Amino acid sequence: FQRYMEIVIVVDHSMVKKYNGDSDSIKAWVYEMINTITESYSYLKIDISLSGLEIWSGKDLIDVEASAGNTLKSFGEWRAKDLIHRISHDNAQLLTATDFDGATIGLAYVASMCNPKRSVGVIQDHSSVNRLVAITLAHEMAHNLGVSHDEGSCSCGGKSCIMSPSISDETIKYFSDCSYIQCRDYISKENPPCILN
Ligand SMILES: [Ca+2]
Ligand SMILES: [Zn+2]
Protein backbone atom coordinates (compact mmCIF):
# COMPACT_ATOMS: atom_id res chain seq x y z
CA PHE A 1 0.00 0.00 0.00
CA GLN A 2 2.91 2.34 0.79
CA ARG A 3 4.37 4.28 -2.19
CA TYR A 4 7.68 6.22 -2.49
CA MET A 5 8.14 9.42 -4.48
CA GLU A 6 11.70 10.52 -5.39
CA ILE A 7 11.67 14.28 -6.05
CA VAL A 8 14.03 16.95 -7.39
CA ILE A 9 13.42 20.63 -6.73
CA VAL A 10 14.79 23.13 -9.28
CA VAL A 11 15.41 26.75 -8.24
CA ASP A 12 15.67 29.22 -11.09
CA HIS A 13 17.92 32.23 -11.60
CA SER A 14 15.28 34.84 -10.66
CA MET A 15 15.13 32.99 -7.33
CA VAL A 16 18.88 33.30 -6.94
CA LYS A 17 18.72 37.07 -7.60
CA LYS A 18 15.89 37.37 -5.09
CA TYR A 19 18.04 35.84 -2.32
CA ASN A 20 21.06 37.91 -3.39
CA GLY A 21 22.94 34.85 -4.60
CA ASP A 22 22.84 33.30 -1.12
CA SER A 23 22.92 29.56 -1.80
CA ASP A 24 22.64 28.47 1.80
CA SER A 25 19.65 30.72 2.44
CA ILE A 26 17.91 29.17 -0.56
CA LYS A 27 18.66 25.62 0.70
CA ALA A 28 17.23 26.39 4.17
CA TRP A 29 14.07 27.74 2.55
CA VAL A 30 13.49 24.67 0.34
CA TYR A 31 14.43 22.21 3.11
CA GLU A 32 11.77 23.59 5.45
CA MET A 33 9.14 23.24 2.70
CA ILE A 34 10.12 19.61 2.15
CA ASN A 35 9.89 18.97 5.89
CA THR A 36 6.32 20.32 5.84
CA ILE A 37 5.09 18.42 2.73
CA THR A 38 6.74 15.16 3.91
CA GLU A 39 4.30 15.20 6.83
CA SER A 40 1.24 16.01 4.63
CA TYR A 41 2.03 13.19 2.22
CA SER A 42 2.81 10.64 4.94
CA TYR A 43 -0.98 10.74 5.77
CA LEU A 44 -1.68 9.56 2.21
CA LYS A 45 0.81 6.69 2.61
CA ILE A 46 3.31 8.26 0.25
CA ASP A 47 6.88 8.77 1.42
CA ILE A 48 8.65 11.79 -0.04
CA SER A 49 12.37 11.47 -0.76
CA LEU A 50 14.43 14.53 -1.74
CA SER A 51 16.63 13.05 -4.51
CA GLY A 52 18.26 16.34 -5.45
CA LEU A 53 18.11 20.15 -5.35
CA GLU A 54 19.37 21.98 -8.44
CA ILE A 55 20.12 25.70 -8.28
CA TRP A 56 20.52 27.67 -11.53
CA SER A 57 23.23 30.07 -10.27
CA GLY A 58 24.92 30.80 -13.59
CA LYS A 59 21.88 31.16 -15.84
CA ASP A 60 18.43 29.66 -16.49
CA LEU A 61 18.51 26.47 -18.62
CA ILE A 62 15.09 27.26 -20.14
CA ASP A 63 13.20 30.43 -20.96
CA VAL A 64 11.08 31.33 -17.99
CA GLU A 65 8.13 33.33 -19.32
CA ALA A 66 5.30 35.30 -17.73
CA SER A 67 3.09 32.65 -19.28
CA ALA A 68 2.81 29.81 -16.74
CA GLY A 69 1.69 27.46 -19.50
CA ASN A 70 4.75 27.98 -21.74
CA THR A 71 7.09 27.75 -18.76
CA LEU A 72 5.66 24.37 -17.59
CA LYS A 73 6.00 22.93 -21.08
CA SER A 74 9.59 24.15 -21.47
CA PHE A 75 10.55 22.78 -18.03
CA GLY A 76 8.97 19.39 -18.69
CA GLU A 77 10.91 19.16 -21.97
CA TRP A 78 14.21 20.15 -20.39
CA ARG A 79 13.54 17.56 -17.67
CA ALA A 80 13.24 14.79 -20.26
CA LYS A 81 16.17 15.99 -22.33
CA ASP A 82 18.66 16.75 -19.55
CA LEU A 83 17.79 16.19 -15.89
CA ILE A 84 16.52 12.60 -16.10
CA HIS A 85 19.96 11.41 -17.42
CA ARG A 86 21.69 13.10 -14.53
CA ILE A 87 19.48 12.17 -11.53
CA SER A 88 17.05 9.28 -11.19
CA HIS A 89 13.79 10.63 -9.74
CA ASP A 90 9.99 10.39 -10.21
CA ASN A 91 8.80 13.99 -10.31
CA ALA A 92 10.41 17.44 -10.57
CA GLN A 93 9.13 20.88 -9.44
CA LEU A 94 10.37 24.31 -10.56
CA LEU A 95 10.52 27.11 -7.94
CA THR A 96 10.54 30.57 -9.54
CA ALA A 97 10.39 34.21 -8.41
CA THR A 98 8.56 35.20 -11.63
CA ASP A 99 5.11 36.69 -11.31
CA PHE A 100 3.04 34.70 -13.84
CA ASP A 101 0.41 36.72 -15.65
CA GLY A 102 -3.24 36.26 -14.70
CA ALA A 103 -4.05 34.99 -11.21
CA THR A 104 -1.47 32.16 -11.49
CA ILE A 105 0.86 31.11 -8.70
CA GLY A 106 1.28 27.46 -9.70
CA LEU A 107 0.61 25.02 -12.53
CA ALA A 108 0.98 21.27 -13.17
CA TYR A 109 0.03 18.46 -15.58
CA VAL A 110 -2.82 16.26 -14.28
CA ALA A 111 -2.39 12.50 -13.63
CA SER A 112 1.11 12.29 -15.14
CA MET A 113 3.27 10.46 -12.57
CA CYS A 114 6.39 8.87 -14.13
CA ASN A 115 5.96 10.54 -17.55
CA PRO A 116 9.44 11.92 -18.60
CA LYS A 117 8.20 15.28 -19.87
CA ARG A 118 4.96 15.56 -17.83
CA SER A 119 5.63 14.48 -14.19
CA VAL A 120 6.42 18.14 -13.36
CA GLY A 121 4.93 21.28 -11.87
CA VAL A 122 5.67 24.97 -11.58
CA ILE A 123 5.27 27.14 -8.43
CA GLN A 124 5.84 30.83 -7.69
CA ASP A 125 7.74 31.63 -4.42
CA HIS A 126 4.75 33.85 -3.70
CA SER A 127 5.01 34.50 0.01
CA SER A 128 7.31 35.26 2.89
CA VAL A 129 5.42 32.70 5.00
CA ASN A 130 7.18 29.39 4.20
CA ARG A 131 4.05 27.36 4.98
CA LEU A 132 1.98 28.98 2.20
CA VAL A 133 4.56 28.31 -0.51
CA ALA A 134 5.08 24.74 0.75
CA ILE A 135 1.30 24.25 0.47
CA THR A 136 1.32 25.29 -3.22
CA LEU A 137 4.21 22.88 -3.91
CA ALA A 138 2.17 20.02 -2.34
CA HIS A 139 -0.89 21.22 -4.31
CA GLU A 140 0.81 21.02 -7.73
CA MET A 141 2.44 17.66 -6.92
CA ALA A 142 -1.06 16.38 -6.03
CA HIS A 143 -2.29 17.44 -9.46
CA ASN A 144 0.42 15.13 -10.93
CA LEU A 145 -1.11 12.31 -8.80
CA GLY A 146 -4.54 12.96 -10.36
CA VAL A 147 -6.25 14.87 -7.54
CA SER A 148 -8.72 17.69 -8.19
CA HIS A 149 -9.81 20.68 -6.10
CA ASP A 150 -11.83 20.32 -2.89
CA GLU A 151 -15.53 21.19 -3.03
CA GLY A 152 -18.65 20.80 -0.93
CA SER A 153 -18.15 18.86 2.28
CA CYS A 154 -14.53 17.76 1.65
CA SER A 155 -12.54 18.23 4.88
CA CYS A 156 -9.24 17.93 6.78
CA GLY A 157 -10.70 18.84 10.20
CA GLY A 158 -11.88 22.12 8.75
CA LYS A 159 -12.73 22.79 5.08
CA SER A 160 -9.85 24.86 3.62
CA CYS A 161 -7.17 22.30 2.91
CA ILE A 162 -4.24 21.84 0.58
CA MET A 163 -6.48 21.29 -2.49
CA SER A 164 -8.54 24.43 -1.95
CA PRO A 165 -9.03 26.40 -5.22
CA SER A 166 -7.68 29.50 -3.39
CA ILE A 167 -4.80 30.01 -0.97
CA SER A 168 -5.21 32.00 2.24
CA ASP A 169 -3.59 31.69 5.67
CA GLU A 170 -6.71 29.90 6.81
CA THR A 171 -5.57 26.95 4.69
CA ILE A 172 -4.46 23.97 6.73
CA LYS A 173 -1.30 22.14 5.61
CA TYR A 174 -3.10 18.74 5.35
CA PHE A 175 -5.06 17.06 2.53
CA SER A 176 -8.83 16.58 2.72
CA ASP A 177 -10.57 13.25 2.76
CA CYS A 178 -11.55 13.87 -0.88
CA SER A 179 -7.85 14.31 -1.79
CA TYR A 180 -6.98 11.04 -0.05
CA ILE A 181 -9.68 9.20 -2.01
CA GLN A 182 -8.73 10.57 -5.46
CA CYS A 183 -5.03 10.04 -4.90
CA ARG A 184 -5.34 6.45 -3.70
CA ASP A 185 -7.90 5.74 -6.48
CA TYR A 186 -5.38 6.96 -9.13
CA ILE A 187 -2.62 4.84 -7.60
CA SER A 188 -5.04 1.92 -7.60
CA LYS A 189 -6.14 2.29 -11.20
CA GLU A 190 -3.06 3.59 -12.98
CA ASN A 191 -0.49 2.05 -10.59
CA PRO A 192 2.43 4.30 -11.77
CA PRO A 193 5.37 1.91 -11.51
CA CYS A 194 7.99 4.55 -10.73
CA ILE A 195 6.63 5.12 -7.22
CA LEU A 196 6.66 1.44 -6.25
CA ASN A 197 10.38 1.27 -5.48
CA1 LIG B 1 11.02 6.03 -7.98
ZN1 LIG C 1 -5.01 23.38 -8.37
- DSSP codes of every residue in 16-42: HHHTTT-HHHHHHHHHHHHHHHHHHHH
CA atoms within 13 A on the CB side of 186: 23
Question: Residue 84: nearest ligand to its CA?
Answer: 1
Q: How many whole angstroms from 3 Cα to the centroid of ligand 1? A: 9
Indicate the DSSP class of residue 114.
T
What kind of experiment solved this structure? X-ray
Question: Residue 138: nearest ligand to its CA?
Answer: 2
For residue 89, say whether it is annotated as part of any ligand binding site. no
List residues in the chain that are followed by a break over 2.5 Å (C to N): none
CA atoms within 13 A on the CB side of 127: 15
For residue 114, say whether it is annotated as part of any ligand binding site. no
Q: Which of 77, 140, 151, 170 is catalytic?
A: 140
Strand segments (E) across 35-156: 46-55, 91-96, 106-108, 120-124
User: Cβ distance 178 to 169 under 8 Å?
Assistant: no
Mapping DSSP to helix (H, G, I), strand (E, B) and coil, where does residue 6 land? strand
Asked about 140 being catalytic, the answer comes back as yes
User: Cβ distance 102 to 69 under 8 Å?
Assistant: no
For residue 191, say whether it is annotated as part of any ligand binding site. no
Domain 1-197 falls in which CATH fold? Collagenase (Catalytic Domain) (3.40.390)
Question: Residue 6: nearest ligand to its CA?
Answer: 1
For residue 143, say whether it is annotated as part of any ligand binding site. yes
Domain boundaries, the chain: 1-197
The contacts of residue 191 (CB under 8 Å, 6+ apart) are none
The contacts of residue 76 (CB under 8 Å, 6+ apart) are 109, 117, 118, 120
Q: What is the CA radius of gyration of the chain?
A: 16
